[PDB]
Motif scaffolding. Structure first.
Motif, PDB file in Angstrom:
ATOM      1  N   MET A 120       0.869  -1.209   0.000  1.00  0.00           N
ATOM      2  CA  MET A 120       0.000   0.000   0.000  1.00  0.00           C
ATOM      3  C   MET A 120       0.895   1.246   0.000  1.00  0.00           C
ATOM      4  O   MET A 120       0.454   2.346   0.271  1.00  0.00           O
ATOM      5  CB  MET A 120      -0.896  -0.018   1.249  1.00  0.00           C
ATOM      6  N   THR A 121       2.162   1.061  -0.300  1.00  0.00           N
ATOM      7  CA  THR A 121       3.137   2.201  -0.318  1.00  0.00           C
ATOM      8  C   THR A 121       2.824   3.170  -1.463  1.00  0.00           C
ATOM      9  O   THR A 121       2.561   2.778  -2.583  1.00  0.00           O
ATOM     10  CB  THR A 121       4.564   1.657  -0.487  1.00  0.00           C
ATOM     11  N   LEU A 122       2.862   4.444  -1.168  1.00  0.00           N
ATOM     12  CA  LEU A 122       2.577   5.494  -2.192  1.00  0.00           C
ATOM     13  C   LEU A 122       3.631   5.441  -3.301  1.00  0.00           C
ATOM     14  O   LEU A 122       3.323   5.584  -4.469  1.00  0.00           O
ATOM     15  CB  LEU A 122       2.618   6.881  -1.522  1.00  0.00           C
ATOM     16  N   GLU A 123       4.872   5.249  -2.937  1.00  0.00           N
ATOM     17  CA  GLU A 123       5.969   5.198  -3.948  1.00  0.00           C
ATOM     18  C   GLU A 123       5.779   3.983  -4.855  1.00  0.00           C
ATOM     19  O   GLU A 123       6.028   4.041  -6.043  1.00  0.00           O
ATOM     20  CB  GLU A 123       7.316   5.086  -3.221  1.00  0.00           C
ATOM     21  N   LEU A 124       5.350   2.882  -4.300  1.00  0.00           N
ATOM     22  CA  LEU A 124       5.147   1.658  -5.120  1.00  0.00           C
ATOM     23  C   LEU A 124       4.054   1.905  -6.153  1.00  0.00           C
ATOM     24  O   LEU A 124       4.169   1.509  -7.298  1.00  0.00           O
ATOM     25  CB  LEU A 124       4.732   0.496  -4.213  1.00  0.00           C
ATOM     26  N   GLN A 125       2.993   2.550  -5.755  1.00  0.00           N
ATOM     27  CA  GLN A 125       1.879   2.828  -6.704  1.00  0.00           C
ATOM     28  C   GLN A 125       2.391   3.764  -7.793  1.00  0.00           C
ATOM     29  O   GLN A 125       2.021   3.656  -8.944  1.00  0.00           O
ATOM     30  CB  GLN A 125       0.717   3.503  -5.956  1.00  0.00           C
ATOM     31  N   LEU A 126       3.233   4.692  -7.425  1.00  0.00           N
ATOM     32  CA  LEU A 126       3.775   5.656  -8.419  1.00  0.00           C
ATOM     33  C   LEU A 126       4.590   4.906  -9.469  1.00  0.00           C
ATOM     34  O   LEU A 126       4.488   5.174 -10.652  1.00  0.00           O
ATOM     35  CB  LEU A 126       4.683   6.667  -7.700  1.00  0.00           C
ATOM     36  N   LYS A 127       5.407   3.982  -9.045  1.00  0.00           N
ATOM     37  CA  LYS A 127       6.246   3.213 -10.007  1.00  0.00           C
ATOM     38  C   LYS A 127       5.341   2.372 -10.898  1.00  0.00           C
ATOM     39  O   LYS A 127       5.513   2.314 -12.101  1.00  0.00           O
ATOM     40  CB  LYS A 127       7.193   2.286  -9.235  1.00  0.00           C
ATOM     41  N   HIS A 128       4.383   1.715 -10.306  1.00  0.00           N
ATOM     42  CA  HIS A 128       3.450   0.857 -11.088  1.00  0.00           C
ATOM     43  C   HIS A 128       2.595   1.733 -11.999  1.00  0.00           C
ATOM     44  O   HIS A 128       2.313   1.381 -13.127  1.00  0.00           O
ATOM     45  CB  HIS A 128       2.545   0.079 -10.123  1.00  0.00           C
ATOM     46  N   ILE A 133      12.734  24.902   0.288  1.00  0.00           N
ATOM     47  CA  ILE A 133      13.616  23.821  -0.226  1.00  0.00           C
ATOM     48  C   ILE A 133      13.000  22.471   0.107  1.00  0.00           C
ATOM     49  O   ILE A 133      13.021  22.019   1.234  1.00  0.00           O
ATOM     50  CB  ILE A 133      14.995  23.945   0.430  1.00  0.00           C
ATOM     51  N   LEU A 134      12.446  21.830  -0.883  1.00  0.00           N
ATOM     52  CA  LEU A 134      11.804  20.499  -0.677  1.00  0.00           C
ATOM     53  C   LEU A 134      12.709  19.399  -1.218  1.00  0.00           C
ATOM     54  O   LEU A 134      13.287  19.511  -2.285  1.00  0.00           O
ATOM     55  CB  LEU A 134      10.459  20.462  -1.413  1.00  0.00           C
ATOM     56  N   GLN A 135      12.817  18.328  -0.483  1.00  0.00           N
ATOM     57  CA  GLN A 135      13.666  17.189  -0.921  1.00  0.00           C
ATOM     58  C   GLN A 135      12.955  16.453  -2.044  1.00  0.00           C
ATOM     59  O   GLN A 135      11.904  15.869  -1.863  1.00  0.00           O
ATOM     60  CB  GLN A 135      13.911  16.243   0.259  1.00  0.00           C
ATOM     61  N   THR A 136      13.529  16.501  -3.214  1.00  0.00           N
ATOM     62  CA  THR A 136      12.919  15.834  -4.400  1.00  0.00           C
ATOM     63  C   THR A 136      13.715  14.585  -4.763  1.00  0.00           C
ATOM     64  O   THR A 136      14.908  14.632  -4.983  1.00  0.00           O
ATOM     65  CB  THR A 136      12.924  16.816  -5.576  1.00  0.00           C
ATOM     66  N   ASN A 137      13.049  13.464  -4.827  1.00  0.00           N
ATOM     67  CA  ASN A 137      13.737  12.183  -5.179  1.00  0.00           C
ATOM     68  C   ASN A 137      13.477  11.852  -6.648  1.00  0.00           C
ATOM     69  O   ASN A 137      12.438  11.333  -7.010  1.00  0.00           O
ATOM     70  CB  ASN A 137      13.194  11.067  -4.287  1.00  0.00           C
ATOM     71  N   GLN A 188      10.340  17.082   5.449  1.00  0.00           N
ATOM     72  CA  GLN A 188      10.418  16.517   6.826  1.00  0.00           C
ATOM     73  C   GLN A 188       9.787  15.125   6.866  1.00  0.00           C
ATOM     74  O   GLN A 188       8.950  14.832   7.697  1.00  0.00           O
ATOM     75  CB  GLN A 188       9.704  17.450   7.805  1.00  0.00           C
ATOM     76  N   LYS A 189      10.208  14.264   5.975  1.00  0.00           N
ATOM     77  CA  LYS A 189       9.676  12.871   5.933  1.00  0.00           C
ATOM     78  C   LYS A 189       8.164  12.914   5.766  1.00  0.00           C
ATOM     79  O   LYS A 189       7.429  12.214   6.434  1.00  0.00           O
ATOM     80  CB  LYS A 189      10.056  12.137   7.223  1.00  0.00           C
ATOM     81  N   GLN A 190       7.700  13.730   4.858  1.00  0.00           N
ATOM     82  CA  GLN A 190       6.233  13.835   4.615  1.00  0.00           C
ATOM     83  C   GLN A 190       5.973  14.171   3.147  1.00  0.00           C
ATOM     84  O   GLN A 190       6.509  15.118   2.598  1.00  0.00           O
ATOM     85  CB  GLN A 190       5.646  14.919   5.510  1.00  0.00           C
ATOM     86  N   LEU A 191       5.150  13.379   2.516  1.00  0.00           N
ATOM     87  CA  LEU A 191       4.819  13.580   1.078  1.00  0.00           C
ATOM     88  C   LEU A 191       4.081  14.902   0.889  1.00  0.00           C
ATOM     89  O   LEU A 191       3.090  15.180   1.533  1.00  0.00           O
ATOM     90  CB  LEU A 191       3.924  12.421   0.611  1.00  0.00           C
ATOM     91  N   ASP A 231       2.634  16.256 -15.302  1.00  0.00           N
ATOM     92  CA  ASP A 231       1.548  15.329 -14.864  1.00  0.00           C
ATOM     93  C   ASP A 231       1.530  15.232 -13.341  1.00  0.00           C
ATOM     94  O   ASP A 231       2.462  14.758 -12.719  1.00  0.00           O
ATOM     95  CB  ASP A 231       1.793  13.945 -15.465  1.00  0.00           C
ATOM     96  N   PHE A 232       0.457  15.678 -12.743  1.00  0.00           N
ATOM     97  CA  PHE A 232       0.321  15.629 -11.255  1.00  0.00           C
ATOM     98  C   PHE A 232      -0.624  14.497 -10.864  1.00  0.00           C
ATOM     99  O   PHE A 232      -1.775  14.460 -11.257  1.00  0.00           O
ATOM    100  CB  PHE A 232      -0.244  16.959 -10.752  1.00  0.00           C
ATOM    101  N   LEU A 233      -0.133  13.570 -10.086  1.00  0.00           N
ATOM    102  CA  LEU A 233      -0.966  12.413  -9.640  1.00  0.00           C
ATOM    103  C   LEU A 233      -1.402  12.636  -8.191  1.00  0.00           C
ATOM    104  O   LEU A 233      -2.398  12.102  -7.748  1.00  0.00           O
ATOM    105  CB  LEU A 233      -0.127  11.136  -9.719  1.00  0.00           C
ATOM    106  N   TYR A 234      -0.667  13.426  -7.450  1.00  0.00           N
ATOM    107  CA  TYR A 234      -1.045  13.691  -6.031  1.00  0.00           C
ATOM    108  C   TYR A 234      -0.496  15.044  -5.597  1.00  0.00           C
ATOM    109  O   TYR A 234       0.699  15.250  -5.503  1.00  0.00           O
ATOM    110  CB  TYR A 234      -0.487  12.594  -5.127  1.00  0.00           C
ATOM    111  N   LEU A 235      -1.380  15.965  -5.322  1.00  0.00           N
ATOM    112  CA  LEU A 235      -0.970  17.327  -4.878  1.00  0.00           C
ATOM    113  C   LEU A 235      -1.431  17.542  -3.442  1.00  0.00           C
ATOM    114  O   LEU A 235      -2.596  17.417  -3.117  1.00  0.00           O
ATOM    115  CB  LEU A 235      -1.613  18.376  -5.799  1.00  0.00           C
ATOM    116  N   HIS A 236      -0.508  17.869  -2.579  1.00  0.00           N
ATOM    117  CA  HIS A 236      -0.850  18.108  -1.148  1.00  0.00           C
ATOM    118  C   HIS A 236       0.031  19.222  -0.591  1.00  0.00           C
ATOM    119  O   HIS A 236       1.197  19.032  -0.302  1.00  0.00           O
ATOM    120  CB  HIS A 236      -0.646  16.829  -0.335  1.00  0.00           C
ATOM    121  N   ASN A 237      -0.540  20.381  -0.437  1.00  0.00           N
ATOM    122  CA  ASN A 237       0.216  21.544   0.104  1.00  0.00           C
ATOM    123  C   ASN A 237       0.471  21.342   1.595  1.00  0.00           C
ATOM    124  O   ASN A 237      -0.117  20.489   2.232  1.00  0.00           O
ATOM    125  CB  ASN A 237      -0.603  22.821  -0.108  1.00  0.00           C
ATOM    126  N   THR A 238       1.360  22.123   2.141  1.00  0.00           N
ATOM    127  CA  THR A 238       1.707  22.008   3.587  1.00  0.00           C
ATOM    128  C   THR A 238       0.470  22.289   4.439  1.00  0.00           C
ATOM    129  O   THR A 238       0.202  21.597   5.404  1.00  0.00           O
ATOM    130  CB  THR A 238       2.800  23.031   3.927  1.00  0.00           C
TER     131      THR A 238
END
Length: 120
Positions: free
Chosen positions: A1-9, A50-54, A74-77, A90-97
């Protein structure tokens, strides 16, 4: 149910690229305004933040000229998106602070081409 896994798939399913091919994660600090368009950062709090972008890059992604990345603070999507060959964002998930503006699970998992009627 990981968000990153769904993004890759989701990305692999979109271009039907091998899912058994692992990509290379790159951790770097970038400004939301420098990456994300001014349309979503016209005056938002993510202005000069400054946001950490992977960013992930692999043979399939490089060949398709696709640059997928995940933004988190800060360890938060915070938001997710990728750039296609058409340079279209292409935006699949947008969540402002503070509060999220756009959040559709169907788009994230790729909703069907029609769901208005099915009972028939």
């Amino acid at each position: 149910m990981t968000l990153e896994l769904q993004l890759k798939h989701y990305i692999t399913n979109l271009f039907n690229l091998p899912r058994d091919e692992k990509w290379e994660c790159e951790s770097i600090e970038e400004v939301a305004d420098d990456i994300l368009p001014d349309q979503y950062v016209r005056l938002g709090p993510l202005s000069n933040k400054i946001l950490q972008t992977n960013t992930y890059y692999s043979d399939t992604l490089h060949k398709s000229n696709i640059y997928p990345f995940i933004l988190y603070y800060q360890k938060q999507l915070i938001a997710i998106g990728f750039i296609d060959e058409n340079h279209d964002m292409d935006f699949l998930y947008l969540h402002n602070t503070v509060m999220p503006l756009l959040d559709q699970r169907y788009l994230l998992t790729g909703g069907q081409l029609e769901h208005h009627h099915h009972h028939h």
